[PDB]
C-alpha cells in the first residue's frame, strides 16, 4: 500500500547545537491541506511542484515560513485520482530530491519557471525531464504507479533530506513532486473528456526557530 | 563459457573512484605574465563529471600530483613554487606582489629533476557535505553555490632574473574515503555550459539506435 | 643503519595506495550527520526496476517509444514483439540502468528478471504467451515451437502483471511475445492498449575489471 | 631445491624490443605475449595449463649512449579497451589505464601484472573453433604497453626499449613431450613435411659402440 | 590389467555455481557403444579419433549433445583386437589431451582433417605425430601396449580433463585416441591378410545442462 | 631517522627475489579448481619409461629406427647390437626424455634402468644375453669375456620382457646384446622379429646448476 | 549402426564358444 522513502520515519532534532529553544507547533498546523485539482486530457504532458514553496502564503503554515528563517519538516503526500472503469492510461508518481529545471535553447530560466506557486508548472520535454535525464532510468527514486484498472491512491512519506540540519524555507527548496502520464489516455466517445487529479499534503514533525519582525 | 561467480571487492563505492586521472593543464610562459593560476574543480573533463553526478551528496579528501616537462624535453634544474590558497584569501596578481610571502598559504618548493611532488587536501566546506545540485537563490545568481570554493594553486617560477622557460604542468587527482549518500540517474544529453545542465532542445539525441521493425529480433 | 635501493626508485605509479602529507595540519573536518540513502555499494542500484525501451523503430517518437502496442485487429499467433536479452550490446537494453553500468566493468555475469505490466481498461480480457528461447539457437517461428520452450501463460483477468526469470546470461537469448487469443473488448471501449516492459538484475550479479565508458564522446 | 617447478621458470630473460623514433609516429605499441623467442617458447610448451603472475622491467638507452634527462610514459591496457592511434589522442587521458611516469637517468621501472583470464588457467592448445578461425583462443588477451615520450615540442630522440619478464607462483598441471621440429609460424605448429630433421645423428653401423 | 589415467575416478559436479538444475541421465545412455572396425595391413600407418566428436549423431547420446550447450563426462575406452598365434607386431594405445593436427607444407587444415566423424582419420607423418612431437618421447601420456603374443585387451579410464568446469560438446574437443602400429606386421604366406581392430566406448557420469530448441 | 647507502644502490640485478607493486589493486583472480595431473617437480617426468633410438644407421628410415632387428640367419655369438650409456652425449640417448632435460642442468648423477621387450610370434623361442660393461674399459670382444661381467640371461619362453639396472653413472659404460642360441621358429612362421628398447631413471637421480639449451638453434 | 542401438550382445570366439539371448514376451513381428 504505502511507500516509505528510504526507510526513515522522520524525527525531531538530534539534540542539535545553537539551541540554548526551537518551537514545536500544535495541531493547528497538522491538518490536511488540499491544493487545487488540475485536468488531464488526451494531449496533456505533465505537471510538477516544489516544496516547501507551494505551501507558502497559505494557512497557518504560511504564517510561520515567512517569519522564521530556520526550518525542518517532513511531508506525507497523498495523491488520488477518480475515474470510471471505461477509461485507461497510467500515471507516475515520483518524489525527487534536488529538482533543477535546466533551461532550453543552446539563456537562464525565469522566476516563475523555477518557483511555480500553488498552481504547478508544466513540462516541455517530458522525455528528458527538463534536466537531460532520461525517463527510462527515472525509477531509482521513490516511485509508485497509479494504474487506472487496479488502484486509485498512492501514498508517499518523505523525510527531511538535506545537508545542513536547518535551512530556510523561502530561498532553498528541498524537493519536488512530478506526475508524468506515461500512457496516453484514450476512451470511447460520449463519455467525460477530462479526468481530475487532486493532491493532499500534511506536515509531520515541523519545527521552527528564530523569529523575524 | 563462464560458470563460476566473481567477487564484490571491486563493485564497492570506495574502489569506484579510487584510481587517479588527469584533471587539468596549465601553461607558464615566462619571458609575459610569469605565473599561472588554476581553480580547484573536479568538473573539468566530462569523463569524471558523468561519474560524479550519479550522486548528490559526497564527502571525500583528495591528493594531487604535479608533473612538469619543458617544451622541448630537456629538463634543466630550476626551482618552482606550488602555493595554495584556502578559500577567502585574495589570489595573486603579479609575479612579485606581497601575496607570495604570507604565512597562511602553504608553499611547496620542488626542483625539476626530482620526482614529482605530492600533497593532500582535507575536506573544506562549512556544510556537512558537498552538493552538486542547489535549487534556489543565495538571473545569473541561480544555481551558484557558495559552498564549493576550494582554492587555487598559482604556480610561479623562483628567480630574480626572469628566465626564458616555457613550461606545461599537469594535475592528477585521487579521491579517498568516499561516502556517497543518495542516487540519481545518469545524464544522457551532452553538455553545453560548464555549470548548468542546459541541453539545446532544438535537437534531442535518443538513447537507442533504430532498427527495421518490431518483429525482427536480429539487429 | 645501511640500506640499498631496488628498482622502483622514483616512479610515480598511478593506481597507488601510498599516503601523502596533509597540507593543513591540526585542521578538523566539520562533523558528519545522519542522512538517508547511504549507498554502500553500486550493486544495490542495479537491482531496482527501470523502464525498458522496446519499440524504438523509426516512426515511434518522444515518450511513446517506451510502449508496446497491442491491437484488436490481430488474429491468433501473430508474434506481437521481440527483443534480444543482451545487457550491453547496442539496442533495446541501452536505455535502462543495468544496461549503463555494464558499459563499465568489462565482464559480467548473473541472472536477470523481466517484469511486464498492462495498461488497459477494467473490462477487457485476453491471454498472452511469454516465451523464452535458449541462447544457442534463433527465435521461434510459430506458436507450437515456442510452447515447447519456457513459456509462462499470462492472462488479463486475474493478474495484471507477470514476471519471468532468465537464468545465467554471460558476456544470444531471445524473448518473444505471442498472441493466444485476440483482444476482447465490450462495446463502447477503445480496442487498443499498451504494455510496458521492466527489467532489473537478481542477487548473484557480479562484475570484474573496470573500464572507462564509450557513450559520452567529447572532452572539456 | 633446484629441480622444482617454481625454480624452473624463476629467473628472468629478454622478451621484446621496441623502437620509438620521434622526429614520424611518436610512439610504439607492443603486445603482451610470452611466445616471443623460441628459447622461452620451447620450455613453456612442455605443459598445457599454467597459472602464474608476472613482473616486468623497462630498460632504455638512447642510440648513441648519452642519457639526457627526459620523461617517458609506460601505459597499460586491460584487454577490452581500444589501443592508441596517434600520439595525442584521447586514449592517453583515461582513468582505466594505469600510467607509470619515469625519467631516463633514474634506475629502470618495475611493475607487476595479476592473472587476467576468465578461465581457471591459460591454455597453450585449443582444439576446435570459437579456416583462419582455427586455434585462435580468445582467452590469452593480456594487453599492450604503448610507450610514449611526454612533451609539447616533438623532441628528436631515437630510443630503444627492452622488456624483461619474470614469473611467480607457477603451478603447471599436465605434461607433454618437447617439440623437436623447428618453428615456421608464430601461432601454429606447422612443420614443413617436405624435409624432416632427425632426433639423432647417424653413425657407421649397429655393431660399433664407438661413435 | 586396467590403466587408470592420473588417478582420478571421475565424479559429478563439486557443487558448482549457476545451477539454481543439471540433469543426470539414466542407463539409457550408459550402454556400450561399438564403433566400426578398421583393417590393419602390412603397409598401414595409423588411426585417430576425437572425443566427444565421434559420438555425435549417434544413439541417445547424439540426442543430448546437440540440444545442450553445457557438458561434462568421462569415458571408458576398451580397445580389443583378435589375431591367431601365427601373426606378429605390436600396437600402441595412447590417450592424449588437447590433440592438435598441425598441417603440412611450409596452409591451414580443412574441416574433415580435424573433425573426422565416426570413421577415424589416418596419419601422414607417424614419426612426428602431425604436431612436430617425436614418438620416442610419446609415453608420458596414459599408455598401454597391445602386444600380440601376450594380451589382447587394453582398458583405459579417462576422467574429465578441462580448464572450465563446463564446456560445449560441438565446437570444443576434450581429447583424442591414437593407435599407432610401432612394429610392422609380418606373417607367413597362406593365412589371413587383414587383422581387425575394434573399439568400445561407454560414458561414466555424464551431466547435461541448459536446453536448446 | 638517519641512514646511509652501501654499494648496490640502483643496480637492476637479474635472478632477483625482491617484490614489486601491483598494477591493479583490489582485483581478484578467478578462483582455481581441482584439475588432474599437477606436477610438483620435474623429477616425476624423467622416471617414466620412454622409447630409445638404437638403430639409427643410414639405411633405417622413418618409424623403423626405433626397432632392433634379430634374424634367423645368425649363428651363435654374433653381437647383435650395442650402444653406450651416456645421457646427454650425442647419439642413441638423444631421442628419449631423460636425454633431453639433461641438456639443461650442467651436472647430474643417479642410477638408470634399461627395459627391453619383444615383438615375436607366440611359438618361437630363443635365448639372449644382456651384458653390461664397467665404464673403465672398452666393449667385450667374445661371448666369454662378457659372461664374466654383469650378464642377465634372458629367454623368450617364460619371460617376454627383462630389465637391467646400471648403478651410478656420472657426468663410458657400454651395454651389449649377444646371441646365445639362434632364433628357432616352427615351419610356416616368418623368422624375423624386432626388439625395442626402453629407458628411464631411478629415484636417486639429482641435478644441479641450470643452463640454457643447445638443440634449438634459431631465434624469433 | 541401426542395430547396435537395439539390444545387441557382442559375441566373440576366443573366450566363449556359445552365447544366449532372451526375447521378452512375444504374443500370438520381431526379427533377430
Short mmCIF file of N, CA and C in Angstrom, two decimals, chain A residues 45-172:
data_model
loop_
_atom_site.label_atom_id
_atom_site.label_comp_id
_atom_site.label_asym_id
_atom_site.label_seq_id
_atom_site.Cartn_x
_atom_site.Cartn_y
_atom_site.Cartn_z
N UNK A 45 0.64 16.86 -20.90
CA UNK A 45 2.04 16.50 -20.94
C UNK A 45 2.72 16.35 -19.59
N UNK A 46 2.15 16.85 -18.50
CA UNK A 46 2.80 16.70 -17.22
C UNK A 46 2.62 17.86 -16.27
N UNK A 47 3.05 17.68 -15.02
CA UNK A 47 2.97 18.71 -14.00
C UNK A 47 4.13 18.50 -13.04
N UNK A 48 4.47 19.55 -12.31
CA UNK A 48 5.35 19.39 -11.16
C UNK A 48 5.12 20.55 -10.20
N UNK A 49 5.63 20.39 -8.98
CA UNK A 49 5.54 21.40 -7.94
C UNK A 49 6.89 21.55 -7.27
N UNK A 50 6.94 22.35 -6.22
CA UNK A 50 8.11 22.46 -5.37
C UNK A 50 7.70 22.47 -3.91
N UNK A 51 8.57 21.96 -3.05
CA UNK A 51 8.34 22.03 -1.62
C UNK A 51 9.54 22.68 -0.94
N UNK A 52 9.31 23.45 0.13
CA UNK A 52 8.03 23.86 0.70
C UNK A 52 7.52 25.14 0.09
N UNK A 53 7.58 25.26 -1.23
CA UNK A 53 7.23 26.51 -1.88
C UNK A 53 5.75 26.61 -2.21
N UNK A 54 5.07 25.49 -2.45
CA UNK A 54 3.64 25.56 -2.74
C UNK A 54 2.80 25.73 -1.49
N UNK A 55 3.38 25.56 -0.31
CA UNK A 55 2.63 25.78 0.92
C UNK A 55 2.75 27.20 1.45
N UNK A 56 3.59 28.04 0.86
CA UNK A 56 3.70 29.41 1.32
C UNK A 56 2.45 30.20 0.94
N UNK A 57 2.32 31.37 1.57
CA UNK A 57 1.17 32.28 1.59
C UNK A 57 -0.17 31.54 1.69
N UNK A 58 -0.21 30.53 2.56
CA UNK A 58 -1.36 29.64 2.67
C UNK A 58 -1.49 29.16 4.11
N UNK A 59 -2.62 29.47 4.74
CA UNK A 59 -2.95 28.90 6.02
C UNK A 59 -2.07 29.36 7.17
N UNK A 60 -2.08 28.55 8.23
CA UNK A 60 -1.26 28.83 9.40
C UNK A 60 0.21 28.60 9.07
N UNK A 61 0.49 27.62 8.21
CA UNK A 61 1.86 27.30 7.84
C UNK A 61 2.49 28.40 7.00
N UNK A 62 1.68 29.16 6.27
CA UNK A 62 2.19 30.34 5.61
C UNK A 62 2.63 31.42 6.59
N UNK A 63 1.98 31.48 7.75
CA UNK A 63 2.32 32.45 8.78
C UNK A 63 3.41 31.96 9.72
N UNK A 64 4.18 30.96 9.31
CA UNK A 64 5.39 30.60 10.03
C UNK A 64 6.60 30.45 9.14
N UNK A 65 6.43 30.17 7.86
CA UNK A 65 7.58 30.07 6.97
C UNK A 65 8.05 31.42 6.47
N UNK A 66 7.31 32.49 6.74
CA UNK A 66 7.73 33.83 6.38
C UNK A 66 8.03 34.69 7.60
N UNK A 67 8.09 34.10 8.78
CA UNK A 67 8.52 34.81 9.98
C UNK A 67 9.46 33.92 10.79
N UNK A 68 10.06 32.94 10.13
CA UNK A 68 11.13 32.15 10.71
C UNK A 68 12.13 31.85 9.61
N UNK A 69 13.41 31.84 9.96
CA UNK A 69 14.46 31.57 9.00
C UNK A 69 15.28 30.34 9.37
N UNK A 70 14.73 29.49 10.23
CA UNK A 70 15.22 28.13 10.41
C UNK A 70 14.03 27.19 10.33
N UNK A 71 14.20 26.08 9.61
CA UNK A 71 13.07 25.27 9.22
C UNK A 71 13.49 23.82 9.09
N UNK A 72 12.56 22.92 9.43
CA UNK A 72 12.76 21.48 9.29
C UNK A 72 11.42 20.79 9.40
N UNK A 73 11.09 19.96 8.41
CA UNK A 73 9.82 19.24 8.43
C UNK A 73 9.89 18.03 7.52
N UNK A 74 8.85 17.20 7.63
CA UNK A 74 8.67 16.09 6.72
C UNK A 74 7.21 15.99 6.31
N UNK A 75 6.99 15.53 5.09
CA UNK A 75 5.68 15.62 4.47
C UNK A 75 5.10 14.24 4.19
N UNK A 76 3.79 14.22 3.94
CA UNK A 76 3.02 13.00 3.67
C UNK A 76 2.15 13.25 2.44
N UNK A 77 2.68 12.97 1.26
CA UNK A 77 1.96 13.20 0.03
C UNK A 77 0.93 12.10 -0.18
N UNK A 78 -0.28 12.49 -0.58
CA UNK A 78 -1.37 11.53 -0.77
C UNK A 78 -2.07 11.87 -2.08
N UNK A 79 -1.58 11.30 -3.18
CA UNK A 79 -2.12 11.59 -4.50
C UNK A 79 -3.29 10.66 -4.77
N UNK A 80 -4.40 11.22 -5.23
CA UNK A 80 -5.59 10.43 -5.51
C UNK A 80 -6.25 10.95 -6.78
N UNK A 81 -6.75 10.04 -7.61
CA UNK A 81 -7.47 10.41 -8.82
C UNK A 81 -8.70 9.54 -8.96
N UNK A 82 -9.70 10.06 -9.67
CA UNK A 82 -11.01 9.42 -9.75
C UNK A 82 -11.41 9.28 -11.21
N UNK A 83 -11.69 8.05 -11.62
CA UNK A 83 -12.12 7.79 -12.99
C UNK A 83 -12.90 6.49 -13.01
N UNK A 84 -13.85 6.43 -13.94
CA UNK A 84 -14.71 5.26 -14.07
C UNK A 84 -13.95 4.13 -14.77
N UNK A 85 -14.62 3.01 -14.97
CA UNK A 85 -13.98 1.81 -15.48
C UNK A 85 -13.96 1.74 -17.00
N UNK A 86 -14.28 2.83 -17.69
CA UNK A 86 -14.25 2.85 -19.14
C UNK A 86 -13.15 3.74 -19.68
N UNK A 87 -12.20 4.12 -18.85
CA UNK A 87 -11.06 4.94 -19.24
C UNK A 87 -9.78 4.14 -19.01
N UNK A 88 -8.69 4.60 -19.62
CA UNK A 88 -7.44 3.89 -19.48
C UNK A 88 -6.28 4.86 -19.54
N UNK A 89 -5.11 4.37 -19.15
CA UNK A 89 -3.92 5.20 -19.09
C UNK A 89 -3.29 5.10 -17.72
N UNK A 90 -1.99 5.37 -17.61
CA UNK A 90 -1.31 5.19 -16.35
C UNK A 90 -0.46 6.40 -16.03
N UNK A 91 -0.53 6.83 -14.79
CA UNK A 91 0.26 7.94 -14.29
C UNK A 91 1.58 7.43 -13.74
N UNK A 92 2.33 8.34 -13.12
CA UNK A 92 3.60 8.02 -12.49
C UNK A 92 3.86 9.04 -11.41
N UNK A 93 4.02 8.59 -10.17
CA UNK A 93 4.27 9.48 -9.05
C UNK A 93 5.70 9.29 -8.60
N UNK A 94 6.47 10.37 -8.59
CA UNK A 94 7.87 10.30 -8.20
C UNK A 94 8.21 11.52 -7.37
N UNK A 95 9.00 11.30 -6.33
CA UNK A 95 9.41 12.35 -5.40
C UNK A 95 10.92 12.44 -5.49
N UNK A 96 11.42 13.45 -6.18
CA UNK A 96 12.84 13.57 -6.49
C UNK A 96 13.43 14.68 -5.63
N UNK A 97 14.47 14.40 -4.85
CA UNK A 97 15.19 15.48 -4.18
C UNK A 97 16.09 16.24 -5.14
N UNK A 98 16.25 17.53 -4.85
CA UNK A 98 17.13 18.45 -5.57
C UNK A 98 16.77 18.53 -7.05
N UNK A 99 15.57 19.02 -7.31
CA UNK A 99 15.00 19.03 -8.65
C UNK A 99 15.33 20.37 -9.30
N UNK A 100 16.09 20.33 -10.39
CA UNK A 100 16.57 21.54 -11.06
C UNK A 100 15.98 21.61 -12.46
N UNK A 101 15.22 22.66 -12.74
CA UNK A 101 14.83 22.96 -14.11
C UNK A 101 16.02 23.59 -14.82
N UNK A 102 16.41 23.03 -15.96
CA UNK A 102 17.64 23.47 -16.60
C UNK A 102 17.43 24.73 -17.43
N UNK A 103 16.61 24.64 -18.47
CA UNK A 103 16.52 25.71 -19.44
C UNK A 103 16.92 25.21 -20.81
N UNK A 104 16.39 25.81 -21.87
CA UNK A 104 16.47 25.24 -23.20
C UNK A 104 17.06 26.24 -24.18
N UNK A 105 17.37 25.74 -25.38
CA UNK A 105 17.75 26.58 -26.49
C UNK A 105 19.18 27.09 -26.49
N UNK A 106 20.14 26.16 -26.59
CA UNK A 106 21.58 26.43 -26.72
C UNK A 106 22.17 27.29 -25.60
N UNK A 107 21.01 32.00 -21.39
CA UNK A 107 19.60 31.63 -21.51
C UNK A 107 19.06 30.97 -20.25
N UNK A 108 19.22 31.65 -19.12
CA UNK A 108 18.76 31.13 -17.85
C UNK A 108 17.23 31.19 -17.77
N UNK A 109 16.61 30.29 -17.01
CA UNK A 109 15.15 30.35 -16.85
C UNK A 109 14.72 31.49 -15.95
N UNK A 110 13.43 31.82 -16.05
CA UNK A 110 12.87 32.95 -15.33
C UNK A 110 12.53 32.62 -13.89
N UNK A 111 11.80 33.54 -13.27
CA UNK A 111 11.41 33.37 -11.87
C UNK A 111 10.30 32.35 -11.72
N UNK A 112 9.17 32.57 -12.41
CA UNK A 112 8.03 31.67 -12.33
C UNK A 112 8.26 30.37 -13.08
N UNK A 113 9.37 30.23 -13.79
CA UNK A 113 9.71 28.94 -14.38
C UNK A 113 10.17 27.97 -13.30
N UNK A 114 10.92 28.45 -12.31
CA UNK A 114 11.51 27.57 -11.32
C UNK A 114 10.80 27.59 -9.97
N UNK A 115 10.06 28.64 -9.65
CA UNK A 115 9.20 28.68 -8.46
C UNK A 115 7.76 28.85 -8.92
N UNK A 116 6.99 27.79 -8.99
CA UNK A 116 5.70 27.88 -9.68
C UNK A 116 4.60 28.56 -8.88
N UNK A 117 4.61 28.41 -7.57
CA UNK A 117 3.45 28.77 -6.79
C UNK A 117 2.52 27.59 -6.63
N UNK A 118 1.28 27.89 -6.22
CA UNK A 118 0.32 26.83 -5.91
C UNK A 118 -0.11 26.08 -7.16
N UNK A 119 -0.49 26.80 -8.20
CA UNK A 119 -0.73 26.17 -9.49
C UNK A 119 0.61 25.72 -10.07
N UNK A 120 0.79 24.40 -10.19
CA UNK A 120 2.07 23.88 -10.61
C UNK A 120 2.35 24.14 -12.07
N UNK A 121 3.63 24.09 -12.42
CA UNK A 121 4.04 24.33 -13.78
C UNK A 121 3.95 23.06 -14.61
N UNK A 122 4.04 23.22 -15.92
CA UNK A 122 4.03 22.10 -16.85
C UNK A 122 5.43 21.90 -17.43
N UNK A 123 5.61 20.77 -18.11
CA UNK A 123 6.87 20.47 -18.76
C UNK A 123 6.88 21.04 -20.17
N UNK A 124 8.00 20.82 -20.86
CA UNK A 124 8.02 20.96 -22.30
C UNK A 124 8.69 19.74 -22.91
N UNK A 125 9.60 19.13 -22.17
CA UNK A 125 10.32 17.94 -22.62
C UNK A 125 10.12 16.84 -21.59
N UNK A 126 8.99 16.13 -21.63
CA UNK A 126 8.77 15.05 -20.66
C UNK A 126 9.67 13.86 -20.88
N UNK A 127 10.28 13.74 -22.05
CA UNK A 127 11.14 12.60 -22.31
C UNK A 127 12.48 12.73 -21.59
N UNK A 128 12.93 13.96 -21.31
CA UNK A 128 14.24 14.12 -20.69
C UNK A 128 14.16 14.96 -19.41
N UNK A 129 12.95 15.12 -18.87
CA UNK A 129 12.67 15.67 -17.54
C UNK A 129 13.16 17.10 -17.34
N UNK A 130 13.45 17.83 -18.43
CA UNK A 130 14.00 19.19 -18.41
C UNK A 130 15.29 19.30 -17.61
N UNK A 131 16.06 18.22 -17.56
CA UNK A 131 17.39 18.26 -16.97
C UNK A 131 18.37 17.39 -17.73
N UNK A 132 17.98 16.84 -18.88
CA UNK A 132 18.87 15.97 -19.62
C UNK A 132 19.00 14.59 -19.03
N UNK A 133 17.97 14.10 -18.36
CA UNK A 133 17.98 12.81 -17.69
C UNK A 133 16.85 11.98 -18.28
N UNK A 134 17.13 10.80 -18.83
CA UNK A 134 16.07 10.04 -19.49
C UNK A 134 15.08 9.46 -18.50
N UNK A 135 13.82 9.37 -18.93
CA UNK A 135 12.77 8.85 -18.06
C UNK A 135 12.86 7.35 -17.90
N UNK A 136 13.60 6.67 -18.78
CA UNK A 136 13.76 5.23 -18.69
C UNK A 136 14.52 4.82 -17.44
N UNK A 137 15.43 5.66 -16.97
CA UNK A 137 16.20 5.36 -15.78
C UNK A 137 15.61 6.00 -14.54
N UNK A 138 14.43 6.59 -14.65
CA UNK A 138 13.95 7.51 -13.63
C UNK A 138 13.18 6.83 -12.52
N UNK A 139 13.42 5.55 -12.24
CA UNK A 139 12.73 4.87 -11.16
C UNK A 139 13.67 4.40 -10.07
N UNK A 140 14.85 5.01 -9.97
CA UNK A 140 15.68 4.79 -8.79
C UNK A 140 15.01 5.42 -7.59
N UNK A 141 14.37 6.56 -7.79
CA UNK A 141 13.68 7.39 -6.82
C UNK A 141 12.52 6.65 -6.15
N UNK A 142 11.98 7.15 -5.04
CA UNK A 142 10.73 6.59 -4.53
C UNK A 142 9.60 6.84 -5.51
N UNK A 143 9.06 5.75 -6.05
CA UNK A 143 8.02 5.84 -7.07
C UNK A 143 6.86 4.94 -6.68
N UNK A 144 5.71 5.24 -7.26
CA UNK A 144 4.51 4.45 -7.00
C UNK A 144 3.53 4.65 -8.15
N UNK A 145 3.16 3.56 -8.81
CA UNK A 145 2.33 3.63 -10.00
C UNK A 145 0.87 3.85 -9.64
N UNK A 146 0.23 4.79 -10.32
CA UNK A 146 -1.22 4.88 -10.35
C UNK A 146 -1.66 4.28 -11.68
N UNK A 147 -2.36 3.17 -11.62
CA UNK A 147 -2.80 2.44 -12.80
C UNK A 147 -4.31 2.34 -12.73
N UNK A 148 -4.99 2.86 -13.74
CA UNK A 148 -6.43 3.12 -13.64
C UNK A 148 -7.29 1.87 -13.75
N UNK A 149 -6.72 0.68 -13.83
CA UNK A 149 -7.53 -0.52 -13.74
C UNK A 149 -7.43 -1.22 -12.40
N UNK A 150 -6.46 -0.86 -11.56
CA UNK A 150 -6.26 -1.56 -10.30
C UNK A 150 -6.51 -0.68 -9.09
N UNK A 151 -5.81 0.44 -8.96
CA UNK A 151 -5.83 1.21 -7.73
C UNK A 151 -6.00 2.69 -8.05
N UNK A 152 -6.36 3.46 -7.03
CA UNK A 152 -6.61 4.88 -7.23
C UNK A 152 -5.97 5.77 -6.18
N UNK A 153 -5.04 5.26 -5.38
CA UNK A 153 -4.33 6.08 -4.42
C UNK A 153 -2.85 5.74 -4.47
N UNK A 154 -2.03 6.69 -4.02
CA UNK A 154 -0.59 6.49 -4.00
C UNK A 154 -0.03 7.33 -2.86
N UNK A 155 0.38 6.68 -1.78
CA UNK A 155 0.76 7.36 -0.55
C UNK A 155 2.26 7.29 -0.37
N UNK A 156 2.90 8.45 -0.27
CA UNK A 156 4.35 8.56 -0.15
C UNK A 156 4.67 9.36 1.11
N UNK A 157 5.55 8.82 1.95
CA UNK A 157 6.04 9.52 3.13
C UNK A 157 7.48 9.92 2.87
N UNK A 158 7.79 11.20 3.08
CA UNK A 158 9.08 11.77 2.71
C UNK A 158 9.73 12.32 3.98
N UNK A 159 10.94 11.91 4.31
CA UNK A 159 11.63 12.50 5.45
C UNK A 159 12.37 13.76 5.05
N UNK A 160 13.09 14.37 5.99
CA UNK A 160 13.81 15.60 5.70
C UNK A 160 15.19 15.25 5.15
N UNK A 161 15.36 15.40 3.84
CA UNK A 161 16.60 15.08 3.15
C UNK A 161 17.33 16.39 2.89
N UNK A 162 18.39 16.66 3.64
CA UNK A 162 19.09 17.92 3.49
C UNK A 162 20.48 17.79 4.07
N UNK A 163 21.39 18.63 3.59
CA UNK A 163 22.77 18.56 4.05
C UNK A 163 22.96 19.26 5.38
N UNK A 164 22.56 20.51 5.47
CA UNK A 164 22.63 21.29 6.70
C UNK A 164 21.37 20.99 7.50
N UNK A 165 21.47 20.67 8.79
CA UNK A 165 20.28 20.23 9.54
C UNK A 165 19.24 21.31 9.81
N UNK A 166 19.48 22.56 9.42
CA UNK A 166 18.44 23.58 9.42
C UNK A 166 18.69 24.50 8.24
N UNK A 167 17.74 24.58 7.32
CA UNK A 167 17.82 25.53 6.22
C UNK A 167 16.59 26.41 6.22
N UNK A 168 16.59 27.40 5.34
CA UNK A 168 15.49 28.34 5.25
C UNK A 168 14.37 27.75 4.42
N UNK A 169 13.23 28.42 4.43
CA UNK A 169 12.02 27.93 3.78
C UNK A 169 11.53 28.84 2.67
N UNK A 170 12.34 29.79 2.23
CA UNK A 170 11.96 30.74 1.19
C UNK A 170 12.86 30.61 -0.03
N UNK A 171 14.17 30.64 0.17
CA UNK A 171 15.10 30.61 -0.94
C UNK A 171 15.42 29.18 -1.37
N UNK A 172 15.81 28.34 -0.43
CA UNK A 172 16.12 26.95 -0.71
C UNK A 172 14.83 26.19 -0.99
#
